[PDB]
């Protein structure tokens, strides 16, 4: 182990004894006096101080943000809407632990590190799709909806949220307001909407708007009913995206840890880094005053930015130690003061 020793070199040049300063108060006294014998008396060997127990942080408050993840009627898959968010903190902690969220899959960012980095802009994409194509929403694969309604780029970043709507979209009479396309001449580019509902033209025949035979209407209707089982239920899917390195950072979530008292801890009250014990005090600040000083410019009190409470700060216990020994002549017992 790494410690401090006092080696005794003889006239011959070979060490013949040693003492370990970390064993006993007597050994500490021997090291302090740099000798192997101590006479009767009281000696001040060192000084002790209680170590800090933990750390706390106190920062200001946050944004509220609810509306996009719970609305009345979500937009269709072929007419998905987008939202713009700026100059407000993104508290994703409330959504990470929420109960009825079923799907959380992404690749660009870590599932738990999304709040440790700061972004610039936030884009929210909201639509409703059947539960069969939840796997299909990932970029890379093709087919229905993924190529005809909503396509994602290969370098897409961000995490999407999907949840069931068993008791919020099912109707006994039947709902058909949710539409999707199965016939498109070209391929949809990533992050592109298709709103035109022109009838499909198949090679030939004069159905170029006549809407007759050998031509089908591309926008078909969904089949959304309590008699349906797993696989046909409508799933609400929201897609979050962002861009970086094109503007100053504006949107990102907040530490603001819990407050503890009556023990020497490390505190950070909007700065003012230090270590000490926190106790309630009767001192009365002015509204604009944050912290107070005693004689000789010593931090006596501080105001918690969260609850505006008045806290008295004093250093935790410290002091010197003294070892009472009757001398190595008689015995080796010691007492500590």
């Amino acid at each position, epitope marked *: 182990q790494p410690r401090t020793f006092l080696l005794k070199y003889n006239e011959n040049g070979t060490i013949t004894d040693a003492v370990d300063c970390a064993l006993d108060p007597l050994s500490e006294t021997k090291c302090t006096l740099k000798s192997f014998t101590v006479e009767k008396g009281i000696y001040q060997t060192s000084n002790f101080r209680v170590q800090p127990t933990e750390s706390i942080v106190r920062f200001p408050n946050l944004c509220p943000f609810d509306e996009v993840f719970n609305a009345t*009627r979500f*937009a*269709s898959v*072929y*007419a998905w*809407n*987008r*939202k*713009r968010i*700026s100059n407000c903190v993104a508290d994703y902690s409330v959504l990470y632990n929420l109960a009825p969220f079923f799907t959380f899959k992404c690749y660009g960012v870590s599932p738990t590190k999304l709040n440790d980095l700061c972004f610039t802009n936030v*884009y929210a994409d909201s639509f409703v799709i059947r539960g069969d194509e939840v796997r299909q929403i990932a970029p890379g694969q093709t087919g229905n909806i993924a190529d005809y309604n909503y396509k994602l780029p290969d370098d897409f970043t961000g995490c999407v949220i999907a949840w069931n709507s068993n008791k919020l979209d099912s109707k006994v009479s039947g709902n058909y307001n949710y*539409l999707y396309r199965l016939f498109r001449k*070209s391929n949809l*580019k*990533p*992050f*592109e*909407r*298709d*709103i*035109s*509902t*022109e009838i499909y033209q198949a090679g030939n025949k004069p159905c170029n708007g006549v809407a007759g035979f050998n031509c089908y209407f591309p*926008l078909r209707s969904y089949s959304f009913r309590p008699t349906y089982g797993v696989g046909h239920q409508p799933y609400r899917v929201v897609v979050l995206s962002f861009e970086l390195l*094109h*503007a100053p950072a504006t949107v990102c979530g907040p530490k603001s840890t819990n407050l503890v008292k009556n023990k020497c801890v490390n505190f950070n009250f909007n700065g003012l880094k230090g270590t000490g014990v926190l106790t309630e005090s009767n001192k009365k600040f002015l509204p604009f005053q944050q912290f107070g000083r005693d004689i000789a410019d010593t931090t006596d009190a501080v105001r918690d930015p969260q609850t505006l409470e008045i806290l008295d700060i004093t250093p935790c216990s410290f002091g010197g130690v003294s070892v009472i020994t009757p001398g190595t002549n008689t015995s080796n017992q010691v007492a500590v003061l």
Partner: antibody, heavy 125, light 107 residues
Framework: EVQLVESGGGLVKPGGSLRLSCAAS????????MSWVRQAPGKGLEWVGR??????????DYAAPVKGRFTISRDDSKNTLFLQMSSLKTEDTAVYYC??????????????????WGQGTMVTV | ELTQDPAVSVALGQTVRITCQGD??????ASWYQQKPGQAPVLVIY???NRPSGIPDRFSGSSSGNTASLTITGPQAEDEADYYC???????????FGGGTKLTVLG
């Protein structure tokens, strides 16, 4: 798919009221974003306002020079747009176009791209 | 408030550059529209660098900080029209439009 037709407009005394009708068909009308644009004769295009869609909240915006004095609305049942004008001025002599913001574009921005336009109508005050 | 030159004089077979100056062009990338004389404006250049379907591969757009540029390769006699740049402001989120520019043919 797409045809946009403009109705209304003409000669009217200052301070009167006039309503412009724009009808669109062939594309889906509740779930798209419209906008209004004007252009003085011999000058550039000038913004008028926006109506947006009810899927996401009504956030009908207006241009700064004509804020408050113009009324906009959307009626998805009859697929018609009504634009009501009040407290007309001598500088309102221009042509008005009803423009669909997005038909086929990569948006990645606010829902405003001005893909397809209309023929426009002439109004004089 | 976007600023554009009044008119551009480029001969046939030469690259035509159309500029649009604005303070907030770092974000809200500008969109370019072409308005024929006595005709409704049409979309030519939008998004990052692409164009709507049906537009011939002759117009390309680029941006650098607070400057937006339009490039024309192999100009014909039917391109004589007005070009407008449209951007967005951060606060009001308005289209504001631009002052436009005039392009002619030196044939």
């Amino acid at each position: 798919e797409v045809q946009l037709v403009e109705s209304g407009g003409g000669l009217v005394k200052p301070g009167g009221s006039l309503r412009l009708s724009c009808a669109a068909s062939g594309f889906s009308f509740s779930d798209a974003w419209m906008s209004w644009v004007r252009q003085a004769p011999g000058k550039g295009l000038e913004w008028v306002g926006r109506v947006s869609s009810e899927i996401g909240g009504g956030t009908t915006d207006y241009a700064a020079p004509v804020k408050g004095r113009f009324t906009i609305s959307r009626d998805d049942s009859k697929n018609t747009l009504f634009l009501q004008m009040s407290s007309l001025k001598t500088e309102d002599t221009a042509v008005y176009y009803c423009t669909t913001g997005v038909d086929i574009v990569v948006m990645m921005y606010a829902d405003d791209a001005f893909d397809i336009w209309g023929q426009g109508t002439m109004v004089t005050v | 408030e976007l600023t554009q030159d009044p008119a551009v004089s480029v001969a046939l077979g030469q690259t035509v550059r159309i500029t649009c100056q604005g303070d907030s062009l770092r974000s809200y990338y500008a969109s370019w529209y072409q308005q024929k004389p006595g005709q409704a404006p049409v979309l030519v250049i939008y998004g990052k660098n692409n164009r709507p379907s049906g537009i011939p591969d002759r117009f390309s757009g680029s941006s650098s900080g607070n400057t937006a540029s339009l490039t024309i390769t192999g100009p014909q006699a039917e391109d004589e029209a007005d070009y407008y740049c449209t951007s967005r402001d951060s606060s009001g989120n308005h289209v504001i439009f631009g002052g436009g520019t005039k392009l002619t043919v030196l044939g």
